[PDB]
Enzyme design. Structure first.
Site, PDB file in Angstrom:
ATOM      1  N   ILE B  86     -38.308 -10.841  22.106  1.00  0.00           N
ATOM      2  CA  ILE B  86     -38.924 -10.509  20.813  1.00  0.00           C
ATOM      3  C   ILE B  86     -38.006  -9.545  20.077  1.00  0.00           C
ATOM      4  O   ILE B  86     -37.763  -8.439  20.549  1.00  0.00           O
ATOM      5  CB  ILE B  86     -40.294  -9.832  20.949  1.00  0.00           C
ATOM      6  CG1 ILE B  86     -41.264 -10.701  21.740  1.00  0.00           C
ATOM      7  CG2 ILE B  86     -40.864  -9.536  19.554  1.00  0.00           C
ATOM      8  CD1 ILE B  86     -42.558  -9.996  22.083  1.00  0.00           C
ATOM      9  N   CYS B  87     -37.514  -9.962  18.919  1.00  0.00           N
ATOM     10  CA  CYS B  87     -36.627  -9.145  18.124  1.00  0.00           C
ATOM     11  C   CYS B  87     -37.450  -8.288  17.161  1.00  0.00           C
ATOM     12  O   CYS B  87     -37.823  -8.757  16.100  1.00  0.00           O
ATOM     13  CB  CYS B  87     -35.708 -10.055  17.337  1.00  0.00           C
ATOM     14  SG  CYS B  87     -34.206  -9.266  16.810  1.00  0.00           S
ATOM     15  N   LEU B  88     -37.731  -7.047  17.563  1.00  0.00           N
ATOM     16  CA  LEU B  88     -38.625  -6.130  16.848  1.00  0.00           C
ATOM     17  C   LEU B  88     -38.108  -4.684  17.008  1.00  0.00           C
ATOM     18  O   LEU B  88     -37.898  -4.229  18.126  1.00  0.00           O
ATOM     19  CB  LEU B  88     -40.061  -6.292  17.395  1.00  0.00           C
ATOM     20  CG  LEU B  88     -41.160  -5.414  16.818  1.00  0.00           C
ATOM     21  CD1 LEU B  88     -41.268  -5.609  15.310  1.00  0.00           C
ATOM     22  CD2 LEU B  88     -42.489  -5.725  17.490  1.00  0.00           C
TER      23      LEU B  88
END
Ligand SMILES: Nc1ncnc2c1ncn2[C@@H]1O[C@H](COP(=O)(O)O)[C@@H](O)[C@H]1O[C@H]1O[C@H](COP(=O)(O)O)[C@@H](O)[C@H]1O
Ligand SMILES: [Zn+2]
Ligand SMILES: [Zn+2]
Lengths: 153, 149
Positions: B86-88
């Site tokens: 998850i790119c967060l």
């Protein structure tokens, strides 16, 4: 804020809130517990002074003086070198709860480690290693004492 | 690792008492350092009606580092790849101990509603998001039906 600030480490209302140079506030004992891991400010990563635990900057020093005379009738204490330390108010409520219910013991988180409070023998010790032992007692507030939770008075 | 443990226990109690919208989470058996989570795709998102399963692992010095959170369910999204990464920003450098898993879960729900093509973990998908939104939504719905229903 009329209310006591929340601590970003434990997510509870701060007990003996201390202010770092960066002006973030945490419980004194959460700062002490994080020091065993060598941590900087949990919120901004700026340095915590080397001597901070010995000379912390209290958010409200007056409220420490009030804690050491504040719970009216009774308080809880743990053994120090040549004197008694008063327990912090949050651990004191847990001890009082357990005692008042007749529990033989209870566990407490104190500065990054779990302690057993042995209410039959009135001793506390680190749950992992039973050798770290301190006598405890439940006495009146008006006795001489070293301080509260490691904070000098 | 008692600081972490007690912090995690506190978050769990608070989460299970007032769970975030669209979300469910809990420990794997008696182990508080491993949780499972579930997100039901938000209404009006392209993922609506999808059930997405996630894993949460807490570091031993929590909350000083973020939890590791991954999707186990396949999803078509510019910020979530086939490994479930998850790119967060709040799972990277913008983590703060003031945040909770509950808040991260809501931010993931917000990312499902409004992807961030300027942080393109899956470049091909990010480009479609920017150039052809109707196509993006069609594909995201197709994958929701295929893999998450
Ligand atoms: N109940 C407690 N409340 C606060 N800190 C505690 C407590 N129990 C242990 N610690 C801290 O945990 C650490 C290990 O204690 P040990 O080995 O027992 O598990 C110690 O820093 C403990 O702090 C104490 O001792 C300090 C020195 O006071 P002197 O002995 O010179 O009177 C002082 O800060 C004081 O508060
Ligand atoms: Zn705290
Ligand atoms: Zn800071």
């Amino acid at each position: 804020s009329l209310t006591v600030p929340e601590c970003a480490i434990c997510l509870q209302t701060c007990v003996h809130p201390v202010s770092l140079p960066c002006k973030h506030v945490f419980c004194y004992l959460c700062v002490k517990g994080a020091s065993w891991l060598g941590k900087r400010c949990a919120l901004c990563r700026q340095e915590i002074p080397e001597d901070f635990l010995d000379k912390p900057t209290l958010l409200s020093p007056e409220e420490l003086k009030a804690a050491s005379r504040g719970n009216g009738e009774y308080a809880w204490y743990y053994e120090g070198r040549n004197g008694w330390w008063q327990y912090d108010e949050r651990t004191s409520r847990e001890l009082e709860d357990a005692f008042s219910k007749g529990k033989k013991n209870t566990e407490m988180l104190i500065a990054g480690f779990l302690y057993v409070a042995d209410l039959e023998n009135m001793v506390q010790y680190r749950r992992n290693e039973h050798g770290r032992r301190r006598k405890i007692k439940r006495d009146i507030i008006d006795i001489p004492k070293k301080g509260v939770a490691g904070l000098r008075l | 690792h008692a600081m972490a443990l007690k912090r995690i226990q506190k978050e769990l109690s608070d989460l299970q008492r007032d769970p975030p919208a669209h979300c469910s989470a809990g420990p794997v058996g008696d182990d508080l350092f491993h949780w499972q989570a579930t997100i039901m795709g938000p209404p009006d998102s392209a993922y609506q009606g999808g059930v997405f399963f996630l894993t949460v692992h807490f570091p031993t010095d929590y909350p000083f580092k973020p939890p590791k959170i991954a999707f186990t369910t396949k999803i078509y999204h510019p910020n979530i790849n086939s490994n479930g990464s998850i790119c967060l920003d709040i799972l990277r450098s913008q983590w703060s101990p003031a945040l909770t898993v509950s808040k991260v879960l809501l931010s993931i729900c917000s990312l499902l509603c409004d992807p961030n093509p300027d942080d393109p973990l899956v470049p091909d998908i990010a480009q479609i998001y920017k150039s052809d939104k109707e196509k993006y939504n069609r594909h995201a719905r197709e994958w929701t039906q295929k893999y998450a229903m």
